[PDB]
Amino acid sequence: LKPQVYHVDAFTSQPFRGNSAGVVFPADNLSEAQMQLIARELGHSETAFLLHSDDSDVRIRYFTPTVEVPIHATVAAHYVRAKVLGLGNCTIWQTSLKHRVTIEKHNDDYRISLEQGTPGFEPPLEGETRAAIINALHLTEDDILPGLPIQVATTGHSKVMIPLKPEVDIDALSPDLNALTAISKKIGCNGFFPFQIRPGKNETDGRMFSPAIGIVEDPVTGNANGPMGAWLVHHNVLPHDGNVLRVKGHQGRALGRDGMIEVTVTIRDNQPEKVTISGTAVILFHAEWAIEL
Amino acid sequence: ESTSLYKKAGLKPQVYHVDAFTSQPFRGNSAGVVFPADNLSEAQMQLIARELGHSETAFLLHSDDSDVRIRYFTPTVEVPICGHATVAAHYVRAKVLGLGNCTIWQTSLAGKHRVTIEKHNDDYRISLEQGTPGFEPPLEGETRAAIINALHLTEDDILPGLPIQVATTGHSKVMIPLKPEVDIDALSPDLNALTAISKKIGCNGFFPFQIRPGKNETDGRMFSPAIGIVEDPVTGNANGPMGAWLVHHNVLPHDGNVLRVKGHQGRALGRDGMIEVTVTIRDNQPEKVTISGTAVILFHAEWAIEL
Question: Under a CB-based contact definition with an 8 Å cutoff, are residues A16 and B50 in contact?
Fold first, then answer.
């Protein structure tokens, strides 16, 4: 009933791993300035504030330490909400600046599934742009998965797909961040997602670099892994039954912030129609605010 | 007569989120405090400090040769001791243990420090003794001009008859005395030029400040881009030396025994804070520097995970 603050690691079961987020609940009597102040104070890359909706179950506003942003803190918010309310195996609808969410409960723990936006792809990056991206990661053409493009994919917040051979030491990558930033201005995408596929498995390991927006590396990124799953279907990279492809995306190992996202792609005529991402989380602690508001 | 540590603080570690050098939430200088922290391993402390994301988190331990032992960690490494985190730490402990007015001893990697606790109307003020005051020779010539140019000021903005000068009580800072007419909040330094100057002079922090007319009070800003911190909200390590420097240059009036200065810092950052600097004086030179501050606990809780 009183404002509480939750410190949550999203897309993991292990404390101190995953992608940390704040959740403040309930946030009904906070102004935009108060929410911005709290987000700055907690210092997570994102803090979620959960409120009452008159046409849904929940409205959520997300703030970085400096500015409001859109719909990992989503998984955190709904995990917290499920735990506090004692939610069951149900469907929830989110309004925020109408998004379908599913909650599953196994063993007194929760998994949260978010349906993403329409999959889409931009024309492949070829020639000098391709070579510029490869050189910025300090790789060569021989490091790239043969016959496949470097290419922006999206389910609502676009990312550059960079398909690497399994032989590549993805954890040793240390990109030229200024060069990535210069490329971002030419291609209209701020996030770069090198990833590789585990041999014989519908599983991947990736890293998401986004220096153009001040985030050098994001530990676990739903908006990268979702489009990667769509992309794998679109370029027929992983075997599937033509109906559903499930990929377990791993991210964050080099940061000591290992996380996991399950990506489920619905398939029609061998093209990705819909993408859902799912993950769990762990609450490290929660408290009532000891101060007024 | 026991503090009854585990009765009052509990048997399980709690995290406290504290703003130091202020009584206003969301202002001052934030620090994590973990209390009690006994039996947490070093690896766990480093992970918790990374997780909380403050500039420092302090871990309060039982001590065999003092009232309390404190370990300090940034997000990446253990450090010997930290001013604002020391204030946060002792504020938490005083309030949780229900302490009155006392003088106690703490132990850390930096040795044995005396700490004074004052209680007035259920609130607390913490006082810490800093290291030996010293000064390096004033910066003149190219160096003075380049510091001034890097703040986008001119010679006309510097307080007449006073040097730009490195002062220290343990962690040195460049004192840059400004006229009261200077709009300190609008300063936007050329950060690359400051870093280059830091390399040349062997000092990683710059402290432009001004004196409020007719008062023993100052407003300052601490820029330290050479060590990756562009601006620190409230810095005991700048304000303490400032106090000593004011005595050494006989800038403010005093009774020949003590100078008390209320230092203000962090307004431009939206993180206003206040440090009271007490300088003991002998023959018009600074002998001893003490800083004092309060704090506010935003929230606290036991961990939901097993540690």
Answer: yes
